[PDB]
């Protein structure tokens, strides 16, 4: 084993040396001679009441009008953003939920949690009700995130240090993705849906291939857990937020870190991260009950969003970029514009 | 508002009505989380998730066990945590003490109380009357400890068993009171595998927890 360990150390050294000959400038100095942004003041336009417990997840729909929300009281609600009407209310077999998703076509929703199953609910059907379509079993730990690729494929992350792809009609795993050392906490898909990234508790993020099943790159700069992750709209960068009280921006073509977003007053964690339609603003939610708007090209704060009485747990931006949605542990949701 | 929009509003109102009814039903029940280790006798106390329901004096209870730095945040609004320890395997007491310290100082659990259950006391009596194993070979400070003078209750047992019991009680309680700021308390108890009076202790302790909660809101304490 001594020979193998020595080879591994040499290879890590070679990687670190090659990712230094490829760094000649910095994003800070490439973007010095441009005019800044200004002050972004946003005001609450809606407040959506109805839950009686903590809120853990939310997801927008592709029509930019409908959204779904998950709560610890054991219920899922489909809202209408423009009028604050309730469209559906789905009872759950378990009350320990940590994720939810909304299909691109609009026919299905998904949810899962501390019971090791991902459930798919059929929304529009005869008989008028909403009923279960499929239950997927096979993970050996709690589910943390799920995203739809199409109407018959889904990607899940779990706390057993693994990720899987499923075929819904048959109900079976197709590819297993392995390699992390700790729990996986979030994942995000690319616009073309041929890659995705996952962030874990070993202070690393990995970039995967969907068809082949392999792992192409690994990024390591943080110093504690990674809770949120998201692509740039381009498809060639992503942002990660940690319990270290920092966010970072990574590149896939140069294979290293370009920018860090920190300030000496923040000492809390980061729970959620999102971008804007242009890729110029970065939204991040904190444990200190409020949310911050960052400039993604100069590492400067552009504004705050202060309206919640408890922890901020989820975040989201509409496809057309007209609104942002936040949910909190104080059982409310808000839309800003 | 058009005709269809008014109909949509009426449907939304009915959804709200059912939500409120379900919430009022759920307000009555009390929730508990059961932690412990293997060989703790954890599954024989109240004689993914394994749930359990029972009631005493017309009050409902709901008990969970999971079979942890991450999912422990979900259990942030429960009434109590029930911690169970075997008090006969001296080789594995220090693991239990460290585990208790970790679960006592957690960030998300700064206002949740703990009900201890030092289980399997008949085996402890046998092993302390046998003489073939020494408690002081594992904790040296047992040589220089004496029972509190005027606070020694017992039902008719030996003095040596009383010393052995009180030492372990002290170890856990003095982890508890080192740094807690008076915002949450620890309630210790002794039980075997045949004790049937275990659903009443939880009821009394929960009544005390709710008394403290009521006092804090009205600024009395």
């Amino acid at each position: 084993l001594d020979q193998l360990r020595q080879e591994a150390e040499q290879l890590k050294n070679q990687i670190r040396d090659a990712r230094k000959a490829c760094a000649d400038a910095t994003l800070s100095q490439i973007t010095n001679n441009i005019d800044p942004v200004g002050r972004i003041q946003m005001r609450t336009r809606r407040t959506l009441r109805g839950h009686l417990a903590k809120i853990y997840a939310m997801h927008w729909g592709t029509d930019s009008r409908l959204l779904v929300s998950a709560s610890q009281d054991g219920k899922l609600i489909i809202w209408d953003s423009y009028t604050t009407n309730k469209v559906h209310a789905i009872p759950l077999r378990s009350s320990w939920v940590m994720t939810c998703a909304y299909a691109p076509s609009g026919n299905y929703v998904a949810c899962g949690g501390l019971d090791n199953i991902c459930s798919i609910y059929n929304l529009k059907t005869r008989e008028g009700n909403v009923r279960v379509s499929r239950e997927l079993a096979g993970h050996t730990g709690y589910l943390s995130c799920c995203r739809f690729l199409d109407d018959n494929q889904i990607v899940t992350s779990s706390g057993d240090t693994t990720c899987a792809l499923w075929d819904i009609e048959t109900g079976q795993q197709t590819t297993t993705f392995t390699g992390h050392t700790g729990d996986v906490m979030s994942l995000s898909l690319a616009p073309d849906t041929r890659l995705f990234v996952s962030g874990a508790c070993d202070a690393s993020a990995k970039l995967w291939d969907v068809r082949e099943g392999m792992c192409r790159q690994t990024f390591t700069g943080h110093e504690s857990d990674i809770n949120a992750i998201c692509f740039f709209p381009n498809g060639n960068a992503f942002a990660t937020g940690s319990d270290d009280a920092t966010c970072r921006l990574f590149d896939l073509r140069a294979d290293q870190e370009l920018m860090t977003y920190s300030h000496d007053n923040i000492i809390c964690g980061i729970t959620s991260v999102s971008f804007s339609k242009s890729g110029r603003l970065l939204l991040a939610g904190y444990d200190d009950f409020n949310c911050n708007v960052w400039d993604a090209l100069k590492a400067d704060r552009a504004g705050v969003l202060a309206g919640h009485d408890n922890r901020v747990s989820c975040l989201g931006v509409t496809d057309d970029g007209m609104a942002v949605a936040t949910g909190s542990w104080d059982s409310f949701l808000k839309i800003w514009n | 508002v058009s005709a269809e929009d008014k109909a949509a509003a009426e449907r939304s109102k009915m959804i709200d009505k059912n939500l409120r009814e379900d919430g009022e039903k759920a307000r009555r029940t009390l929730r508990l989380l059961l932690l412990g280790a293997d060989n703790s006798g954890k599954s024989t106390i109240v004689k993914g998730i394994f749930e359990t329901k029972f009631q005493v004096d017309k009050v409902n209870f709901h008990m969970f066990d999971v079979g942890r730095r991450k999912w422990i945040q979900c259990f942030n609004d429960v009434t109590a945590i029930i911690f169970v320890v075997d008090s006969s395997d001296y080789n594995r007491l220090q693991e239990a003490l460290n585990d208790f310290k970790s679960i006592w100082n957690n960030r998300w659990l700064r206002t949740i109380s703990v009900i201890l259950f030092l289980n399997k006391q008949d085996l402890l009596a046998e092993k302390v009357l046998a003489g073939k194993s020494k408690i002081e070979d594992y904790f040296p400070e047992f040589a220089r400890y004496t029972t509190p003078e005027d606070a020694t209750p017992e039902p008719g047992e030996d003095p040596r068993v009383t010393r052995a019991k009180y030492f372990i009680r002290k170890e856990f309680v003095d982890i508890s009171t080192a740094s807690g700021d008076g915002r949450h308390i620890c309630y210790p108890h002794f039980t075997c595998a045949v004790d049937t009076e275990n659903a009443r202790r939880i009821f009394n302790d929960c009544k005390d927890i709710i008394l403290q909660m009521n006092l804090r809101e009205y600024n009395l304490v």
Partner: single-chain antibody
Amino acid sequence: VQLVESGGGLVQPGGSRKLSCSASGFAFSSFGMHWVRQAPEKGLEWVAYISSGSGTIYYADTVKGRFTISRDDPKNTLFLQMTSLRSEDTAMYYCVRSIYYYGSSPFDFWGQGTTLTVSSDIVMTQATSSVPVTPGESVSISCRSSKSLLHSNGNTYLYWFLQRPGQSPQLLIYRMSNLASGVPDRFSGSGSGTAFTLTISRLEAEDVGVYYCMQHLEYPLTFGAGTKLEL
């Protein structure tokens, strides 16, 4: 899904009768239910409405004070009670289900009917009354309204129905552009305010009958007169 209706028969003038409709196959308690009648040779006219939760009721002005609507959710039944029957009430009666939320498709299912023989408003017209067609062609049908059907929120409330010989009508287009479930993709519809058209491509047998257009902007609900296609 099913809806079966009973009652009917001869009734002397001035008498009384009760019509009942029994459901089986769907979640009845979350649907709002209508009554629609058809004369011996005329078009379709609306009668009443009961809401989910029984919180709203509406009546046509021709039957107010004589007819009453009710529902019994646990046994899944709908009722209509006659009083002071006249000679203009000879018709065949239908029961219709409708559900209202964002993106819904009201007026989905129409039951069969029962016969009963006894011994302002938005007027909207279908000028064409008979068109002869041959298979493999394309045909267009028009009806226009009295006032505009385009609300502020952006929806044009207009509906299209089809009634084949000796059957009960079915839904094709809801809100002037959308296509119902089970309907082949050769039907289409478009228009502006106060003008509407339906286009059929590759016309076939089993696509002949009478076509109706309805408005759903404000009560009462108002139907057209009927364009029919002949071989």
